[PDB]
Enzyme design. Sequence first.
Site, mmCIF file in Angstrom:
data_model
loop_
_atom_site.group_PDB
_atom_site.id
_atom_site.type_symbol
_atom_site.label_atom_id
_atom_site.label_comp_id
_atom_site.label_asym_id
_atom_site.label_seq_id
_atom_site.Cartn_x
_atom_site.Cartn_y
_atom_site.Cartn_z
ATOM 1 C CG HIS A 1 -2.296 -0.995 0.759
ATOM 2 N ND1 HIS A 1 -3.177 -0.741 -0.125
ATOM 3 C CD2 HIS A 1 -2.479 -2.229 1.135
ATOM 4 C CE1 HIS A 1 -3.782 -1.836 0.023
ATOM 5 N NE2 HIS A 1 -3.718 -2.631 0.857
ATOM 6 C CD1 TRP B 1 -5.853 2.256 1.601
ATOM 7 C CD2 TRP B 1 -6.433 -0.090 1.140
ATOM 8 N NE1 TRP B 1 -5.758 2.206 0.334
ATOM 9 C CE2 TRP B 1 -6.618 0.939 0.005
ATOM 10 C CE3 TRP B 1 -6.864 -1.110 1.104
ATOM 11 C CZ2 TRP B 1 -6.785 0.205 -1.196
ATOM 12 C CZ3 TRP B 1 -7.372 -1.518 -0.285
ATOM 13 C CH2 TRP B 1 -7.266 -0.812 -1.371
ATOM 14 C CE1 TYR C 1 -7.762 0.639 -15.433
ATOM 15 C CE2 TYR C 1 -6.172 -0.717 -14.419
ATOM 16 C CZ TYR C 1 -7.152 0.557 -14.339
ATOM 17 O OH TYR C 1 -7.521 0.808 -13.049
ATOM 18 C CG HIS D 1 -7.929 -6.803 -7.697
ATOM 19 N ND1 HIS D 1 -8.753 -6.310 -8.657
ATOM 20 C CD2 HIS D 1 -6.607 -6.760 -7.939
ATOM 21 C CE1 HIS D 1 -7.997 -5.713 -9.620
ATOM 22 N NE2 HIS D 1 -7.004 -5.918 -9.212
ATOM 23 C CE1 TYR E 1 -2.562 -5.021 -11.489
ATOM 24 C CE2 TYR E 1 -2.983 -5.973 -8.965
ATOM 25 C CZ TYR E 1 -3.302 -5.213 -10.103
ATOM 26 O OH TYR E 1 -4.661 -4.929 -10.060
#
Length: 186
Positions: free
Chosen positions: A17, A87, A129, A166, A181
């Site tokens: 994060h 978060w 994207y 995700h 990723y």
Amino acid sequence: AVKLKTDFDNPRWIKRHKHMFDFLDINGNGKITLDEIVSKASDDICAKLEATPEQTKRHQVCVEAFFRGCGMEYGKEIAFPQYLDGWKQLATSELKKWARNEPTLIREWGDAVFDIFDGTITLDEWKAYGKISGISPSQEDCEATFRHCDLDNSGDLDVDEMTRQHLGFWYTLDPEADGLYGNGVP
Ligand SMILES: O=C1N2C=C(c3ccc(O)cc3)N=C(Cc3ccccc3)C2=N[C@@]1(Cc1ccc(O)cc1)OO
């Protein structure tokens, strides 16, 4: 089997994060606003993707809801620690929704994004994207994404799958989500 246990003090989650935070902090002044996030979503991404105004608007609503989930708001400058607490709250709420089969904010965001590329997206669309949002500009990393996930028969990525991944990646540090990723996001 999606991991639902949180690991908020694991340096890898925190780092994931902080990486994303710095990524959103173009300025590099250690602070971000909802205004910048929404401008990135609407002015940058959706425009370059040439989404219809309807798709653009619904995507923007999803982004607004999602980041408001972590305590972001227009005109409100947020630094990393507060961001991370936000978060923790978001992740908790989202996992509770997921367990109850209530649609998550990450799922609905996903629905908007996929609807723009329209119920699946291709490897090339994902590379697009990746470079446009800037989350995964290395095409190799996008290919690593498609190798990581369970694709359909056509070799395409489903929104269900991407949602599960995700959840694992952003909320719970699910080992099964590691490398989602490629090397683009730790
Ligand atoms: O998940 C995604 N993201 C997560 C974060 C992000 C940001 C900060 C964090 O601390 C953690 C994660 N940032 C961005 C990129 C972005 C940010 C802001 C506005 C627009 C786009 C982003 N794009 C998504 C969009 C998406 C969503 C669901 C799908 O099924 C497919 C694609 O794709 O992976």
